[PDB]
Design a protein around this ligand. Structure first.
Ligand SMILES: [Zn+2]
Lengths: 112, 44, 56, 124
RNA sequence: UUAAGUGAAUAAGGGCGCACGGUGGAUGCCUUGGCACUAGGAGCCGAUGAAGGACGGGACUAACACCGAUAUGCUUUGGGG
RNA sequence: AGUGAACCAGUACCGUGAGGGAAAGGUGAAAAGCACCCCGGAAGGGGAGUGAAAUAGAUCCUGAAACCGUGUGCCUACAAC
RNA sequence: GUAUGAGUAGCGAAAGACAGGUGAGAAUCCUGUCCACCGUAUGACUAAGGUUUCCUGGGGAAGGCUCGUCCGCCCAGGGUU
């Protein structure tokens, strides 16, 4: 019997550097602790990781596992997605580029 | 700070339009060189 | 002033070691158990200091 | 005494507005710096409402906003109370026998667009 | 016990090796389009209104192809099933 | 690469104008192109199914390097490389 | 195609506050109350110029230097006598 479940979000419109500050606060924790830690951080990406973590938990409960009380956050990371390209007009007739970045976010939960 | 392009409807037709290009011998050189390239607009 | 040399991966990451986040004092509510910030109202049940506050 | 991001006359306007609210509503949500400055101003109004006389009334009327109503009242008419009339008929007699300290602040949560720490300031 | 001596382990972060991912579109294989020629035809259209266009025609019709108020087509002679 | 143009190209775009002028091919043998359920406002994901193969799921053959991460065997806080 | 500088400069003259609505979600949308700004103009009408931006009902992937339930944005219908 498999004892593990993942979820992932793809091309979310946040930057991958800032999402990594939040996700290092949550790695290796029990699922009980991670939710309250995410509820009290006011950073934009804190509530997106909350949804990915909750999908991992629902998958565990319904598709395979049981025992929401035993679960632990075992793996977590943030990768890069494709970037949009824009230009902002500058002084004296020239222009400079601007990157609109994206993230893939994946969380994994094991029974222990 | 007045720029160079000030739009006007009559002037654009009177300086660049089909009949002005048709009335000279060099205007028709222009129209033939545009038809030979495949332009969807040959005269303003 | 302009950077005379690009900065490598090790020096960038050595700069970035004091660039983190903290999650300071979190306790358990006295009324309903769930975690909450100390000296704040409990957002789950609206109780602070053993009484009801976000109600009428 | 806390400049609050404003010039000298805009700070005064803003305080005069936030203390006339809370006289009319008795419970309000605001940020944490404004709430402290306002606890000071509102209790200074209540100890004039407890004094009672004409000189105290005209002293308060330099600070309480005017064309605002505060009505839960009808015997048979449209009879309006004036938010200075409430200060002198209702809130002073309420805190007759209490010494200072007519308000209290509780902390809730940071605003979504800001991360500004918010706060509830109420009376009793 | 007191003195003199010798002294490991513990990483806030970093390096090297390895394993797995992400981004990005090189490489291989492929062709719907091109390039250089050969043999044969044809080498002008137009006031009986041209070359090129504008605007229209469909049960629903923005666009391309076709067609012209007889408008996504009409008659006639042959082929085909 | 081969025509500027293998794809709705003398187009989009640039200029008052004459004129200048691009980028952009590939799921599978067959759409069989994911019914039903679960988390979620949705996007996205996990099962279950199609299929020889889905890490072939439409940003779809192969999938190199720069660059960004996660895990670990060994080293590192008296040292001028 | 992707780094470094770096989560750094900047976010383009100016007064808001609170209550209540809507909503998955509100400093930024709606309704109210008080406050503040222009007033030979920051008010009303018109010729150029633009060319559907005008009205009603929905939407939230991109545009909007933040946000967005909103819009001179997107989808469907309609308006000029
Ligand atoms: Zn509680």
């Amino acid at each position: 019997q498999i004892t593990s479940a993942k979820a992932t979000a793809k091309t979310v419109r946040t930057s991958p550097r800032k999402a990594r500050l939040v996700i290092d606060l949550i790695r290796g924790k029990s699922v009980a602790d991670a939710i309250s830690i995410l509820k009290f951080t006011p950073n934009k990406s804190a509530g997106i990781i909350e949804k990915v973590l909750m999908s991992a938990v629902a998958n565990a409960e319904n598709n395979f596992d049981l025992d929401v009380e035993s679960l632990v956050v075992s793996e977590a990371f943030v990768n890069e997605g494709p970037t949009m390209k824009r230009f902002r007009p500058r002084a004296k007739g020239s222009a400079s580029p601007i990157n609109k970045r994206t993230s893939h976010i994946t969380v994994v939960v094991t029974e222990k | 700070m007045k720029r160079t392009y000030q739009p006007n409807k009559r002037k654009r037709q009177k300086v660049h339009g089909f009949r002005k290009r048709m009335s000279t011998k060099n205007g028709r050189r222009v129209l033939a060189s545009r038809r030979r390239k495949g332009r969807k607009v040959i005269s303003a | 002033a302009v950077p005379a040399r690009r900065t490598s991966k090790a020096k960038k990451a050595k700069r970035r070691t004091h660039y983190k986040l903290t999650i300071k004092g979190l306790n358990a509510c006295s009324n309903c158990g769930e975690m909450k910030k100390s000296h704040h109202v409990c957002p789950a049940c609206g109780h602070y200091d053993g009484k009801d506050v976000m109600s009428k | 005494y806390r400049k609050l991001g404003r010039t000298s006359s805009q700070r005064k306007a803003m305080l005069r507005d936030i203390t006339t609210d809370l006289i009319i509503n008795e419970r309000i949500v605001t940020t944490e710096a404004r709430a402290k400055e306002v606890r000071s101003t509102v209790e200074k109004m209540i100890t004039l409402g407890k004094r009672g006389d004409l000189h105290a009334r005209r002293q308060a009327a330099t600070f309480v906003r005017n064309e605002v109503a505060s009505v839960r009242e009808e015997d048979e008419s449209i009879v309006v109370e004036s938010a200075l009339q409430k200060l002198f008929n209702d809130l002073g007699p309420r805190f007759a026998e209490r010494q200072g300290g007519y308000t209290r602040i509780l902390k809730t949560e940071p605003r979504r667009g800001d991360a500004a720490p918010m706060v509830v300031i109420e009376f009793v």
